Design an enzyme around this catalytic site. Sequence first.
Site, mmCIF file in Angstrom:
data_model
loop_
_atom_site.group_PDB
_atom_site.id
_atom_site.type_symbol
_atom_site.label_atom_id
_atom_site.label_comp_id
_atom_site.label_asym_id
_atom_site.label_seq_id
_atom_site.Cartn_x
_atom_site.Cartn_y
_atom_site.Cartn_z
ATOM 1 N N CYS A 404 -31.153 9.536 -44.459
ATOM 2 C CA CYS A 404 -30.417 10.719 -44.020
ATOM 3 C C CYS A 404 -29.691 11.185 -45.371
ATOM 4 C CB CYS A 404 -29.815 10.348 -42.907
ATOM 5 S SG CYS A 404 -29.139 11.912 -42.433
ATOM 6 N N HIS A 525 -33.482 8.772 -39.588
ATOM 7 C CA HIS A 525 -32.734 7.245 -39.555
ATOM 8 C C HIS A 525 -33.697 6.339 -39.182
ATOM 9 C CE1 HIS A 525 -28.127 7.631 -40.416
ATOM 10 N NE2 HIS A 525 -28.359 9.020 -39.917
ATOM 11 N N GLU A 527 -33.336 3.256 -39.219
ATOM 12 C CA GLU A 527 -32.592 1.831 -38.903
ATOM 13 C C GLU A 527 -32.884 1.647 -37.309
ATOM 14 O OE1 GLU A 527 -28.894 4.310 -40.630
ATOM 15 O OE2 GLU A 527 -31.309 4.804 -40.332
#
Lengths: 559, 559, 559
Positions: A404, A525, A527
Amino acid sequence: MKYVVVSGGVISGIGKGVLASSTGMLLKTLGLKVTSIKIDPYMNIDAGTMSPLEHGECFVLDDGGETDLDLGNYERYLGITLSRDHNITTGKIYSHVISRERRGDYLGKTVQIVPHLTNAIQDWIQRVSKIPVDDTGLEPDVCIIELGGTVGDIESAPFVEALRQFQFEVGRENFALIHVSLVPVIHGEQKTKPTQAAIKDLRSLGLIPDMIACRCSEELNRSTIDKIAMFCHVGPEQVVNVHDVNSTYHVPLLLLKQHMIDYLHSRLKLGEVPLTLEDKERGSQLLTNWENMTKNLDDSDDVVKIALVGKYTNLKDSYLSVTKSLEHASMKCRRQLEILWVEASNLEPETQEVDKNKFHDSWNKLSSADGILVPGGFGTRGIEGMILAAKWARESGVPFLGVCLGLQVAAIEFARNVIGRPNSSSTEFLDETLLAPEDQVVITMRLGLRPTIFQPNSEWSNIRKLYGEVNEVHERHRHRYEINPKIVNDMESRGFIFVGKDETGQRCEIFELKGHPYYVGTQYHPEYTSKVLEPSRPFWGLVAAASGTLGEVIKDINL
Amino acid sequence: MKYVVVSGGVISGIGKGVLASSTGMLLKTLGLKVTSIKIDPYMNIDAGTMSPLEHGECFVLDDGGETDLDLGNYERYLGITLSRDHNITTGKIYSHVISRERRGDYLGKTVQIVPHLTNAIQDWIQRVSKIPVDDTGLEPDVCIIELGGTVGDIESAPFVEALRQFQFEVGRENFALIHVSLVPVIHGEQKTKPTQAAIKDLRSLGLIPDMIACRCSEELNRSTIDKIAMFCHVGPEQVVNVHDVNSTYHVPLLLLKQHMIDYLHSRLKLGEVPLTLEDKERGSQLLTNWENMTKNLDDSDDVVKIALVGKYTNLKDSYLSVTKSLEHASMKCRRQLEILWVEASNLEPETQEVDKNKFHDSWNKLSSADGILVPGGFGTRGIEGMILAAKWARESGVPFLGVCLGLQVAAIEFARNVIGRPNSSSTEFLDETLLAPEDQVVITMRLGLRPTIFQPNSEWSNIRKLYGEVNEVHERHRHRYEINPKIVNDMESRGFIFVGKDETGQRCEIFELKGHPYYVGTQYHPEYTSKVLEPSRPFWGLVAAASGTLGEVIKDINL
Amino acid sequence: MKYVVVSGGVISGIGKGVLASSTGMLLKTLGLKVTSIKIDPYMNIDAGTMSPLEHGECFVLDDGGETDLDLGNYERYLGITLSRDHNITTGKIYSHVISRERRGDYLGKTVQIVPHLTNAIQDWIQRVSKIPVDDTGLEPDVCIIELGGTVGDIESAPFVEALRQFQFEVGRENFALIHVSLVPVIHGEQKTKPTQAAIKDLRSLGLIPDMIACRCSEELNRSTIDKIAMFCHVGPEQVVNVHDVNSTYHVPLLLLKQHMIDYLHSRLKLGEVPLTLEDKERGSQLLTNWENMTKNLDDSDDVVKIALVGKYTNLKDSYLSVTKSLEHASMKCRRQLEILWVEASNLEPETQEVDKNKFHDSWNKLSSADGILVPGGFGTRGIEGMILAAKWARESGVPFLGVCLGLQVAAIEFARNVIGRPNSSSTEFLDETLLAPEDQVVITMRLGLRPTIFQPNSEWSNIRKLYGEVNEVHERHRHRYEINPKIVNDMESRGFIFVGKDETGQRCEIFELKGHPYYVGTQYHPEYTSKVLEPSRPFWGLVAAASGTLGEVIKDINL
Ligand SMILES: Nc1ccn([C@@H]2O[C@H](COP(=O)(O)OP(=O)(O)OP(=O)(O)O)[C@@H](O)[C@H]2O)c(=O)n1
Ligand SMILES: Nc1ccn([C@@H]2O[C@H](COP(=O)(O)OP(=O)(O)OP(=O)(O)O)[C@@H](O)[C@H]2O)c(=O)n1
Ligand SMILES: Nc1ccn([C@@H]2O[C@H](COP(=O)(O)OP(=O)(O)OP(=O)(O)O)[C@@H](O)[C@H]2O)c(=O)n1
Ligand SMILES: Nc1ccn([C@@H]2O[C@H](COP(=O)(O)OP(=O)(O)OP(=O)(O)O)[C@@H](O)[C@H]2O)c(=O)n1
Ligand SMILES: Nc1ccn([C@@H]2O[C@H](COP(=O)(O)OP(=O)(O)OP(=O)(O)O)[C@@H](O)[C@H]2O)c(=O)n1
Ligand SMILES: Nc1ccn([C@@H]2O[C@H](COP(=O)(O)OP(=O)(O)OP(=O)(O)O)[C@@H](O)[C@H]2O)c(=O)n1
Ligand SMILES: [Mg+2]
Ligand SMILES: [Mg+2]
Ligand SMILES: [Mg+2]
Ligand SMILES: [Mg+2]
Ligand SMILES: [Mg+2]
Ligand SMILES: [Mg+2]
């Protein structure tokens, strides 16, 4: 349908979220299509209003629903996709029934919180547990409900009543309660009276417990279990101990040594649920993947050091999903992880005027790292340190991932230090200057799971090898500000090639730098989509490059 | 009119389609104008919705009717042209009578599936068997019905009832049933109880069998036949054995050694059907063409290796018509065939990063081939391998045929590697880039038998010699995307000459490259029109060029 | 959820529909929220295409869904409202999955009828049994499935397979099978071999039976039950006998004497279903209403004769809902019913030229009647007889109800015989004459449950007293043609007052004639909404007026 509610506590910091995320994992090894619900007693509608300083990171779902951390723990343990409805809150259900009053649907009766609002909870849990969550639209076999707060509170109160009715509005033998509890140790003696003073309140508020999952500092004594089984009505085999072990990925296998599948198979009659061999054999295979990855953790020794470079690193829960994705990537590479916390503002040369020790320790940690991560920060006040770490990662050849904001400081770094515009700026920060070299623009929010398409020439890109060379990638986004698309034709000429873009072509979403071992920006993102048996491809790329054998990982993917 | 229904099976994988396509061939040697009907118990209206992964290739008829594979086997064995009505399905007949209900034609009665829908089947078979299928509009003498599924099922059920009534609504002695059946071998003993448990069900569902066509692993014992003729009511001469032989083109001649024409001539009184000498002598001549081509297969030894280059080569039925057309072309050249399966994505250099063994085996098979075929693939994900095989085939002089997508990758190859536009692209794949060097354009579907006209200068083209130099060619098409006609004036200048075009002139349908032994693209599908005694001219060209003696084939055609 | 499937039969005329409509009634006495599903093996999508000559009347649902008769029997026995989805048909499910193929939802697989279509049945039954049906939106506790056709057929075949899978896809102990069966009597001996030859087929098609509900001409012998319990595996207590009794409203209480609630309470564990006292006490009260109304039938003697005046009276099933509504109204008045079948065309004076016996018998039956009904006929060819019966009912003061066409012939009668226009006509019949005195107009269809509002002055109207004086009435409609609203201001002046209208005011839906004991037209169909404990208010009005004590019924309603 079946329910297991995970609940209880003398104290709210006791760690129920592992026993929830780990009970549901054990049931998924029977092959059952498991789902999960979080109850949070706070008044927030959804987490988007509360800053990452205040009880950890701002999660993202496929819906764009900015949500409680604890959804993430079930998603990554259970492989499931959740929706913003799976987070029950005091904010949501009271906003729901009070908005329903002005709509009139109670026919102008009183809307007492007994009967009517506890009926809305019991309706919401029955709606939500029938929403599909796996790779196919099949409705769940079992639902794990994590009751946030404690049983014996005033923010818990409508939920514990709603769940007393729900013990009958769904029949017993379709419902089970797991009570997490505290057994302090003082002067060498195990103290089971905090637990016995939460079993009294549990019976009083009207649920009846099945398990008594103690968070003692020790193994429970055989005499401690025998007394807890005398004061609670559970048999002594059911007084599970959830003590610390070498990593939280072992916790399911401790509960499996403590008979918890054999008990839940009996106590919910799970043999009566219809399963195919495609369910059951996926179940017993997933168990062997968990036994394998925990055995790999037990004798992996070769370290890999990843620098996580950003603000607020003392608040590690502000990055919980970033940390957990590196742990998945680590265990898949079979290298043991150390993460190096680089508080980014300390890399900035002005720190040398304030404290030299901070300036040296931070550059020491950054220089020691086998790989570098700019972890999608928030605000702007550490940005110059994140630019210096991106300069270092480009020139010193060290493996790099920008998530990001990380992609965005990489474009700012490359503009200032390769394209040669030293005044080029984050429009996210230096706005009312109105300068021409804007590396970013506002394009008012963009959230949730979105489609990223690879640009045509991309075949050589290590990031495209890590995504299996598939033409489109589905991943979760958050960004107000995006790269100014009027610089891209310059970066595309200078070897900073935008591997992936939005379906309109106008928005830039992945880059990889030509002629570096591994240097990637992702503006989504990566993650949140990582699972304990499927690490997120950019993070598997980083921990592989830093371990060496990035090529051998690219075979393990593409075979 | 006469009918022979081919039917039965203990198991559905038993291979009825050869006994159908081979019974009808034997009856065509009496000179009878034979036709055939496929019954498929599946619910698909027509095959266009179901991908070539899912039970094999997507066939094409003169109508444009995308249809079941088994139509193709009768077309190529019997020389006939079929129509999309010849494929009866559970989808079609139920969609027909249920659409007829909303139209009202049962006068507001009940539309029970007994009486009325089984009457629609018996009407459909009587319509369809009177449609003409040979080179003249004469109605068929005999119809072969292949009953898909098995007799003793729930998807078969209306068909076996409809055919019990049809045993009388058309008189006995105008109808005969051939029951294919399983005779397993276990511990060295032939087991005729699966067969005797499908003769019980056959009599029960109400048809009476004539033949008992066993698919044993062996020759049937004289005692095995004697017991099948004791439990079924057929005489022992009628218990035909359909065991494996050196190629499926021998199967008719095994059935001819097993008296099956002499039995069917009696059991349907085929001496009472009116025949001319132009019928009968064509019949006995076609028998000698089948005896000749099977004798040529029995002692042809000189191999020809053809590389078939495409995706999904592990699903060989995804190319069944391509394979069968090369077998016809092979037997006509009197060279024995080996086809080299090149899974195209393995030729792409990125495969060397994933598995070198795949990269070498695929380029080894391609380099070993005496001729090369790009076989009208589907999707786009293997396209770079198909371009490299087209580069190889152009530069290394190896004989080449591009079918459908094969013509299109040949234009893309020639653009990238001779015209010198390395960014030129399949608009079929790289669409929303909006680039100017588009080798293709969408022009929403185009299907069925269409007229191809040769462009004026074409006299020198080997493909035009193979079509007998006739000015127009009638062949079957499928394509959404066609060559961008704004590149043609460049290719026409560079020696890539468009031998054939659509009647409007605006669409390009054949090319031949100047100054190569044999290098052809055809954008129609030449596979589907090949017959066992008339191989498709582009495929006869390929297997001739690869065998050598392409000139001697051009005399055999034009004399 | 729980299911009871009612099924079976050696013969299809055996009368399963009472055992379905009567098993579900017994379960509703436990207080369970019961629902029901009809399976009809016919190919009709819905009954609107098939004329009332062809297996009985054209039913109407709240949706406007023109449907199978057997929905009506459950609605009136169980008090439930059904929807057009509750009628599964071979037409519907095959039209559904074949339309779903052209939509593509099987991802281009084969859509075999095993696996995929039997999965659509098992999905449809699981959708439909969760639709609410009582006065509140609570989902059903138990679903009765009536399997039309027989188990052992070719129109039944996908349903019996779907239900074999559904015996597991919903667990055993949530499913039970009731097999209706034939036990013929010949030369004085009970013959249980037709039954034993449908238990063989049941086990074969794969369901296992629970009950063996014989339709013998007699009480079953203790030795007959003992042998059926030797050849079927049920215990002898479970071999229920469903022999004839004084009216079909007794049949539930025979099954209750034969332990069938005590068996179904055990065999589906109905004690584990959650019930309130508001459920249970409504259950045991409804049982006493059924014991009371059957006791009232057992000693009601005072007859009431109602003339049902219309075409096709030899096809009594063309009026099944009309007959059944008079039976409810009868038992509520405590007068025993005789219905006088007046074949309307016989009342027309031209019949005297053809057969005087018909002219006298029909006018004799009409003159003998204590009350008169024009029963919403179809077509037009009997209309003059229905006008003469309306003249008779107006002038001779006899109680009258006109349903649908009945309201319309009442307006035509009143126009010809009170307003004095002898050429006034049904525009439904005498159309292309284009005359000015049109009593009707076409306004292309209007179906389902619609709102009728009472006109303001209506307080005196006996029909408005029977509807409890409530301002709006919700009832089911069918009509293409409606009263020409330009005559209404004349009829409103002459004492023919339109008590009720559509919400726009423009359409006329009820009238009552001033100064007659009871003379009503309703242009909706009041038949379909009658329940066995709640007779339809216009029909309760008719049978009360004809019994005398219309005033005493108006107290029983309004108290
Ligand atoms: N499978 C799990 C579950 C939890 N945690 C850790 O647990 C944390 C927070 O504690 P948790 O067990 O989630 O519960 P509490 O925060 O104590 O809250 P509560 O007891 O109210 O549920 C985070 O630091 C997270 O790293 C983890 O690492 N792995
Ligand atoms: N519910 C209870 C439990 C214990 N006792 C009494 O309280 C005394 C002191 O409590 P303790 O012995 O400490 O009992 P525990 O429950 O073990 O307390 P802890 O776990 O804190 O040691 C006991 O001897 C017993 O007589 C009591 O009155 N009520
Ligand atoms: N004259 C024939 C007939 C069939 N086949 C082969 O047979 C195949 C499929 O089997 P088939 O005999 O067509 O029948 P099944 O697929 O087994 O299906 P069914 O028994 O249901 O008819 C294809 O691989 C095709 O190559 C062939 O080569 N030549
Ligand atoms: N329809 C039949 C056929 C055989 N048998 C009996 O079953 C015994 C065993 O069957 P088997 O001898 O195996 O007969 P086959 O039909 O040859 O069985 P298979 O073909 O499998 O060998 C026979 O000796 C015979 O007495 C029977 O009861 N009914
Ligand atoms: N509770 C019931 C059920 C049925 N019937 C009568 O039964 C009829 C038709 O028979 P039914 O019992 O509905 O079944 P069948 O028509 O024989 O059809 P199936 O056996 O296929 O269900 C109608 O005449 C109706 O009057 C009735 O009066 N009361
Ligand atoms: N499934 C059965 C039932 C009976 N029998 C034999 O057939 C004889 C004649 O049948 P029957 O005595 O009529 O038996 P039921 O089943 O009662 O026949 P039905 O009900 O028609 O009287 C019996 O004595 C018995 O030996 C048989 O072979 N198989
Ligand atoms: Mg606190
Ligand atoms: Mg927590
Ligand atoms: Mg199969
Ligand atoms: Mg086949
Ligand atoms: Mg019949
Ligand atoms: Mg019926």
